[PDB]
Amino acid sequence: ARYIGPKLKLSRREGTDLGLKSGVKPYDVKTKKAARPPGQHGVSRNKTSEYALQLREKQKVKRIYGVLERQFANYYKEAARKRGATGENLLAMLESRLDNVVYRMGFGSTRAEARQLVSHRTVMVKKAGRDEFVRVNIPSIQLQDGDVIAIQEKSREQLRIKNAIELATQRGIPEWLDVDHSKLQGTFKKAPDRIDLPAEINESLIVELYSK
Amino acid sequence: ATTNQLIRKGRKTIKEKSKVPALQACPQRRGVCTRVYTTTPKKPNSAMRKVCRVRLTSGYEVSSYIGGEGHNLQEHSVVLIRGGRVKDLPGVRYHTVRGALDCAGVKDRKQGRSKYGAKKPK
Amino acid sequence: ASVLTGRVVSDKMDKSITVLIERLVRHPLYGKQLRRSTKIKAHDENNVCQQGDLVRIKETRPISKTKAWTLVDVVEKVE
Amino acid sequence: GLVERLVTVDRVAKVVKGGRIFSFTALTVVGDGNGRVGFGRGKAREVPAAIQKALEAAKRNMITVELNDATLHHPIKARHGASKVYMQPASEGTGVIAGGAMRAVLEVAGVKDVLTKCYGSTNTANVVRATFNGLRDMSTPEKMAAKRGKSVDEIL
Amino acid sequence: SMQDTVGDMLTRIRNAQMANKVSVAMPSSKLRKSIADLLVSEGYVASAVVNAEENNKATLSIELKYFEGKAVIETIQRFSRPGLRQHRGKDAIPTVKQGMGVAIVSTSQGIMSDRAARAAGIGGEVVAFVA
RNA sequence: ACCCUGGUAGUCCACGCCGUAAACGAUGUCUACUAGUCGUUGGGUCCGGACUUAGUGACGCAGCUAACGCAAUAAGUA
RNA sequence: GCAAGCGUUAAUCGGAAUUACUGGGCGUAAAGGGAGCGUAGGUGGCUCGAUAAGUCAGAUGUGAAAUCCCCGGGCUUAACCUGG
RNA sequence: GGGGCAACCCUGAUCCAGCCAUGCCGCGUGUGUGAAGAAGGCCUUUUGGUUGUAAAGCACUUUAAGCAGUGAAGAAGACUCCGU
RNA sequence: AAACUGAAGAGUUUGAUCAUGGCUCAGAUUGAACGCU
């Protein structure tokens, strides 16, 4: 499954911007909220707890990447099984997801549209070494070093990708991705680093939530 | 407890018996209501709690609680029984499953309907 | 083959001796070793050794209902 | 830049002829974030005043701990009264695996990765005291080498 | 009765160090002198000398060290007591204080440090932990 | 019942049972080691004192203890 | 908060250092046997030798495969399968 | 795997298919934009808040399901002919 | 090269406290059943 309902109340509950809307206009005027979380009460008494902080951070990351609890707990399990920092590996996996990669490469205005673009078999992927693209419809496909992403020839002239590109131009393009707009192609040259990802997501909170 | 004493005698972990013997390590169990009555709770609380004495297929004759507001149970009613004791009812260690076999669900239940066997209103 | 060494605790059968084979066994949980002994019936064809000697026996085919070890070396006698 | 963390606030009562006199006890841990940490307790009839007194008492119970980067140098087992604490250095990215009372003092002292466990009584003040004692009694390889007289390479 | 000679020697050292004694003397044995020699070579005690007294007896005298007011021996605990002996392999010797301490190991090549036994690829009785 | 006046078993002896007590230091036995101070019992050796021994007490550091407290007669260190 | 599932009941381990080997206690919280003698057992002074059973190390044989873990590979991904 | 020289026969082993959310894993139930922030519900100090860009309206997309096509691999080349 | 990575506590005895100590809870798992879907 995936979240379908209104997106701005997610950011309102998180207290920050989750990039759930295209950057066509500032987040402040897009909602005139985010000073208070959704619902009747919002700003409340009886201050939050350590568990509340940990849960809110985990839900922040989950809602950023559109990933549900079972998938995200498998992500954490693999991240803790892999050599290195657990939170760093979890962020690396969530950023190596195919829908997030096409979002960051700019073919979708938002991550949900990028996911719906991948799922509808409009995005082709060429694994490093393989001399052939394949049409994939699995948004949670991880990309290795050197994987190439392309747009299906049937849908290269899309009136939504043609502004997702110009919006990505105004938002900023990561260095670990190489995008050719003329041929509508991208390359995942390397997994992103913790110094490249924003230093406002506290992954220590997630790692301490996932330890009972 | 020296090493020699531990090797000679050992440590002993006594095993706690089940709090729901009549189920015989089953999730639920079927019975027939041999009595449908009400009873008064323990000291802090006061009410007329609805209980049924039910004879299960396991050979036990136990007391189970009918939760929710209102029930259709009576003598010779075939009910399903699960674990879980009522805190203020002494001797009641089981709950009657509402909506299982012959115990009807709660009529106008809306919130926790699956806990009372109530179908989704359309 | 396999050779064991132990004292002779019984000899009162014909062509037969019981041998006490001591062994050290480590407790699986508490780590200490406990002295453990098994009585092994051995074949004493010539009825040589008496009770209290330290002898060596070796495994062979069954000789009787409970005898499958045979005397191979008397190393020390009682005092 | 002294980080102040309120561990516990509890309602205590004195009994007089008229009835009960309700005070308030607070426990705080303050820290530099690198190697300075100190705990303190405060009592007052109101929660803000108890917290302020706890903060001021914590600021004068300072010790200087020596971190191994962002973790401990060696495993520690410490105690205060019936409270026993175990602390173990962990790999980078583990986090402070600790429940509440240990976590307050460790995070405030600046430990980033540690495995902890409480045994015996988990009274918050006694647990904080035990963790404080373990941190204060922690030694470093350089200090051990200086103690013996050898070097950090003749003392692996 | 006294049935742990190594434990007695270690307790003597511990009690003298808690009492801020300059030196501790005890009846000497070759195993005690070897353990004291390892302590001297590890730098936990200043020296250890065996004075041969009369009646085929000997006194082991150990000079203790104090650094910055505190005792140099922070802790010294017997591991393999007579009632429960502990033997470990080369990769099973317990590390004391992450390696900043010493595990006294009596191996077939003599009594050495745990790090020395690990370097030699050897094991033996783990008699004490000194930190 | 407590109180008073009486009073039999028992209390005493011999020989057997009984095998229990807050049979307590509510602290198993045996070792070694760890500031000190003041009594006292039975010795010993010196010059009325000093030292030392085996008990038996009152204190009191370190250490231990939830606290009370224990503290060379440990509830300390093993 | 989970999500084509979500709850409840049953059951095992965990948290429980609450049988404590790792890793607990017994003056007063539960807990020193009324005291002793002692059998089996457990444990045990110093020095020089022998032995090598325990112990330690090495070699060799075995410890099926599957499973677990690590490095790869094949299903669009994953589950799954698979080489070492 | 059984029998037969073969042809071939037998094989409820097995390879498949059916039923079941019983589990694990994967995907979907749309995606963007959209304010005098519509109505209705709820709360309220009776006028504001909230449901909420949520809806409607616009602009798109068609994964899975459906319809129509095409279409590997699982097959080890039997028999027969020729040569050595 | 690697197999070498792992450890959280809370409530409840008291006017209040510390300790002791039981009971209860948060996790994981299932050849599961049941209720709603």
Coordinates of N, CA and C in Angstrom, one line a residue, chain B residues 11-122:
Chain B
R11 N 20.4 -25.6 39.9 CA 19.3 -24.5 40.0 C 18.0 -25.1 39.5
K12 N 16.9 -24.6 40.0 CA 15.6 -25.1 39.7 C 14.7 -23.9 39.3
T13 N 14.2 -24.0 38.1 CA 13.1 -23.1 37.6 C 11.8 -23.8 37.6
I14 N 11.0 -23.5 38.6 CA 9.6 -24.1 38.6 C 8.8 -23.5 37.5
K15 N 7.9 -24.3 37.0 CA 7.1 -23.9 35.8 C 5.7 -23.4 36.2
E16 N 5.4 -22.2 35.8 CA 4.1 -21.7 36.1 C 3.0 -22.3 35.2
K17 N 1.9 -22.8 35.9 CA 0.8 -23.4 35.1 C 0.0 -22.3 34.4
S18 N -0.7 -22.7 33.4 CA -1.5 -21.8 32.6 C -2.7 -21.2 33.4
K19 N -3.0 -20.0 33.2 CA -4.1 -19.3 33.8 C -5.4 -19.6 33.2
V20 N -5.4 -20.3 32.1 CA -6.7 -20.7 31.4 C -6.6 -22.2 31.2
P21 N -6.8 -23.0 32.2 CA -6.7 -24.5 32.0 C -7.7 -25.0 31.1
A22 N -8.9 -24.5 31.2 CA -10.1 -25.0 30.5 C -9.9 -25.0 29.0
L23 N -9.1 -24.0 28.4 CA -8.9 -24.0 27.0 C -8.0 -25.1 26.5
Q24 N -7.2 -25.7 27.4 CA -6.2 -26.8 27.1 C -5.3 -26.4 26.0
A25 N -4.7 -25.2 26.2 CA -3.7 -24.6 25.2 C -4.3 -24.5 23.8
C26 N -5.5 -24.0 23.8 CA -6.2 -23.7 22.5 C -6.6 -22.2 22.5
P27 N -6.6 -21.6 21.3 CA -7.0 -20.1 21.2 C -8.4 -19.9 21.8
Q28 N -9.3 -20.7 21.3 CA -10.7 -20.6 21.8 C -11.2 -22.1 22.1
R29 N -12.4 -22.2 22.5 CA -13.0 -23.5 22.8 C -14.5 -23.3 22.8
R30 N -15.2 -24.3 22.4 CA -16.7 -24.3 22.2 C -17.4 -24.9 23.4
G31 N -18.5 -24.3 23.9 CA -19.2 -24.8 25.0 C -20.7 -24.6 24.8
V32 N -21.5 -25.0 25.8 CA -22.9 -24.8 25.9 C -23.1 -24.1 27.2
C33 N -23.9 -23.0 27.2 CA -24.2 -22.2 28.4 C -25.1 -23.0 29.3
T34 N -24.6 -23.5 30.4 CA -25.5 -24.2 31.4 C -26.2 -23.2 32.3
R35 N -25.8 -21.9 32.3 CA -26.5 -20.9 33.1 C -26.1 -19.5 32.6
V36 N -27.0 -18.6 32.5 CA -26.8 -17.2 32.1 C -27.3 -16.4 33.2
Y37 N -26.4 -15.7 34.0 CA -26.8 -15.0 35.2 C -26.0 -13.7 35.3
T38 N -26.2 -13.0 36.3 CA -25.5 -11.7 36.6 C -24.9 -11.9 38.0
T39 N -23.8 -11.1 38.2 CA -23.2 -11.1 39.5 C -22.6 -9.7 39.8
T40 N -22.3 -9.5 41.1 CA -21.7 -8.3 41.6 C -20.2 -8.3 41.7
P41 N -19.5 -7.2 41.3 CA -18.1 -7.2 41.3 C -17.5 -7.1 42.7
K42 N -16.1 -7.0 42.7 CA -15.4 -6.9 44.0 C -15.5 -5.5 44.6
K43 N -14.8 -5.3 45.7 CA -15.1 -4.2 46.6 C -15.2 -2.8 46.0
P44 N -14.3 -2.3 45.2 CA -14.4 -0.9 44.7 C -15.6 -0.7 43.8
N45 N -15.9 -1.7 43.0 CA -16.8 -1.6 41.9 C -18.2 -2.1 42.3
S46 N -19.2 -1.7 41.6 CA -20.6 -2.1 41.8 C -21.3 -2.1 40.4
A47 N -21.9 -3.2 40.1 CA -22.6 -3.4 38.8 C -23.3 -4.8 38.8
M48 N -24.0 -5.1 37.7 CA -24.6 -6.4 37.5 C -23.9 -7.0 36.3
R49 N -22.7 -7.6 36.4 CA -22.0 -8.1 35.3 C -22.5 -9.4 34.8
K50 N -22.6 -9.5 33.5 CA -23.3 -10.7 32.8 C -22.3 -11.8 32.6
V51 N -22.6 -12.9 33.3 CA -21.7 -14.1 33.3 C -22.5 -15.3 32.7
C52 N -21.8 -16.2 32.1 CA -22.5 -17.5 31.8 C -21.6 -18.6 32.3
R53 N -22.2 -19.6 33.0 CA -21.5 -20.9 33.3 C -21.7 -21.8 32.1
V54 N -20.6 -22.2 31.5 CA -20.5 -22.9 30.2 C -19.7 -24.2 30.4
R55 N -20.2 -25.3 29.8 CA -19.4 -26.5 29.8 C -18.8 -26.7 28.5
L56 N -17.4 -26.8 28.5 CA -16.7 -26.8 27.3 C -16.5 -28.2 26.8
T57 N -16.1 -28.3 25.5 CA -15.7 -29.6 24.9 C -14.5 -30.3 25.5
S58 N -13.8 -29.5 26.3 CA -12.6 -30.0 27.0 C -12.9 -30.7 28.3
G59 N -14.2 -30.7 28.7 CA -14.6 -31.4 30.0 C -14.6 -30.5 31.2
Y60 N -14.4 -29.2 31.0 CA -14.4 -28.3 32.1 C -15.7 -27.5 32.2
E61 N -16.2 -27.1 33.3 CA -17.4 -26.3 33.5 C -17.0 -25.0 34.2
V62 N -16.8 -24.0 33.4 CA -16.2 -22.7 33.8 C -17.1 -21.6 33.6
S63 N -16.7 -20.5 34.2 CA -17.5 -19.2 34.1 C -16.8 -18.3 33.2
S64 N -17.6 -17.7 32.2 CA -17.0 -16.8 31.2 C -17.9 -15.5 31.2
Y65 N -17.3 -14.4 30.8 CA -17.9 -13.1 30.9 C -18.5 -12.7 29.5
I66 N -19.7 -12.2 29.5 CA -20.3 -11.7 28.3 C -20.1 -10.2 28.2
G67 N -19.1 -9.7 27.4 CA -18.9 -8.3 27.3 C -19.8 -7.6 26.3
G68 N -19.8 -6.3 26.4 CA -20.7 -5.5 25.6 C -22.0 -5.3 26.3
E69 N -22.8 -4.4 25.6 CA -24.1 -4.0 26.2 C -25.2 -4.9 25.5
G70 N -25.8 -5.8 26.2 CA -26.8 -6.6 25.7 C -26.4 -7.9 25.1
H71 N -27.1 -9.0 25.3 CA -26.7 -10.3 24.7 C -28.0 -11.1 24.5
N72 N -27.8 -12.1 23.7 CA -28.9 -13.0 23.4 C -28.8 -14.4 24.0
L73 N -27.8 -14.6 24.8 CA -27.4 -15.9 25.4 C -28.5 -16.4 26.4
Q74 N -28.7 -17.7 26.4 CA -29.6 -18.3 27.3 C -29.2 -19.7 27.6
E75 N -30.0 -20.5 28.2 CA -29.7 -21.9 28.4 C -29.5 -22.6 27.1
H76 N -28.6 -23.6 27.1 CA -28.3 -24.4 25.9 C -27.9 -23.6 24.7
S77 N -27.2 -22.5 24.9 CA -26.6 -21.6 23.9 C -25.2 -22.1 23.6
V78 N -24.9 -22.3 22.4 CA -23.5 -22.7 22.0 C -22.7 -21.5 21.8
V79 N -21.6 -21.4 22.6 CA -20.8 -20.2 22.6 C -19.3 -20.6 22.4
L80 N -18.5 -19.6 22.0 CA -17.1 -19.7 21.9 C -16.5 -19.0 23.0
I81 N -15.4 -19.5 23.6 CA -14.8 -19.0 24.8 C -13.3 -18.8 24.6
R82 N -12.8 -17.7 24.9 CA -11.4 -17.3 24.9 C -10.9 -17.0 26.3
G83 N -9.6 -16.8 26.4 CA -9.0 -16.5 27.6 C -9.2 -15.0 28.0
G84 N -8.7 -14.7 29.2 CA -8.8 -13.4 29.7 C -9.7 -13.2 30.9
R85 N -9.1 -12.9 32.1 CA -9.9 -12.9 33.3 C -10.5 -11.5 33.5
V86 N -11.6 -11.4 34.1 CA -12.2 -10.2 34.6 C -11.7 -9.8 35.9
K87 N -11.1 -8.6 36.0 CA -10.3 -8.3 37.2 C -11.2 -8.3 38.5
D88 N -12.4 -7.7 38.4 CA -13.2 -7.6 39.6 C -14.2 -8.7 39.7
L89 N -14.2 -9.7 38.9 CA -15.1 -10.9 39.1 C -14.2 -12.1 39.5
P90 N -14.4 -12.5 40.8 CA -13.6 -13.7 41.2 C -14.2 -15.0 40.6
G91 N -13.3 -15.8 40.1 CA -13.6 -17.0 39.4 C -14.0 -17.0 38.0
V92 N -13.9 -15.8 37.4 CA -14.2 -15.7 35.9 C -12.9 -15.4 35.2
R93 N -12.5 -16.4 34.4 CA -11.2 -16.4 33.8 C -11.3 -16.5 32.3
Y94 N -12.5 -16.3 31.7 CA -12.7 -16.5 30.3 C -13.6 -15.4 29.8
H95 N -13.6 -15.1 28.5 CA -14.5 -14.2 27.9 C -15.3 -15.0 26.8
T96 N -16.5 -14.6 26.6 CA -17.3 -15.1 25.5 C -17.1 -14.3 24.2
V97 N -16.8 -15.0 23.2 CA -16.6 -14.3 21.9 C -17.9 -14.0 21.3
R98 N -18.1 -12.7 21.0 CA -19.4 -12.2 20.5 C -19.4 -12.3 19.0
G99 N -20.4 -12.9 18.4 CA -20.4 -13.0 17.0 C -19.8 -14.3 16.4
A100 N -19.4 -15.2 17.3 CA -18.7 -16.4 16.9 C -19.6 -17.5 16.4
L101 N -20.4 -18.1 17.3 CA -21.3 -19.2 16.9 C -22.7 -18.9 17.1
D102 N -23.2 -18.6 18.3 CA -24.5 -18.3 18.6 C -24.7 -17.0 19.4
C103 N -23.6 -16.5 20.0 CA -23.6 -15.2 20.7 C -23.6 -14.1 19.7
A104 N -24.6 -13.3 19.6 CA -24.7 -12.3 18.6 C -23.8 -11.1 18.9
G105 N -23.4 -10.4 17.9 CA -22.6 -9.2 18.1 C -23.4 -8.1 18.8
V106 N -22.8 -7.1 19.2 CA -23.4 -5.9 19.9 C -24.2 -5.1 18.8
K107 N -25.4 -4.8 19.1 CA -26.4 -4.3 18.1 C -25.9 -3.0 17.4
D108 N -25.8 -1.9 18.2 CA -25.4 -0.6 17.6 C -24.0 -0.2 17.9
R109 N -23.1 -1.2 18.0 CA -21.7 -0.9 18.2 C -21.1 -0.2 17.0
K110 N -20.3 0.8 17.2 CA -19.7 1.5 16.1 C -18.2 1.6 16.2
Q111 N -17.6 1.8 17.4 CA -16.2 2.0 17.4 C -15.3 0.8 17.4
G112 N -15.4 -0.1 18.4 CA -14.5 -1.2 18.5 C -15.2 -2.5 18.0
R113 N -15.8 -2.5 16.8 CA -16.8 -3.4 16.4 C -16.2 -4.9 16.3
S114 N -15.0 -5.0 15.9 CA -14.4 -6.4 15.8 C -14.2 -7.0 17.1
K115 N -14.1 -6.2 18.2 CA -14.0 -6.7 19.5 C -15.3 -7.2 20.1
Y116 N -16.4 -7.0 19.4 CA -17.7 -7.3 19.8 C -18.5 -8.0 18.6
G117 N -17.8 -8.4 17.6 CA -18.5 -9.1 16.5 C -19.5 -8.4 15.8
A118 N -19.4 -7.1 15.6 CA -20.4 -6.2 15.0 C -20.0 -5.9 13.5
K119 N -20.8 -6.2 12.6 CA -20.6 -6.0 11.2 C -20.5 -4.5 10.9
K120 N -19.8 -4.2 9.8 CA -19.6 -2.8 9.4 C -20.9 -2.3 8.9
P121 N -21.4 -1.2 9.5 CA -22.6 -0.6 9.0 C -22.4 0.0 7.6
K122 N -23.4 -0.2 6.7 CA -23.3 0.2 5.3 C -24.1 1.5 5.0

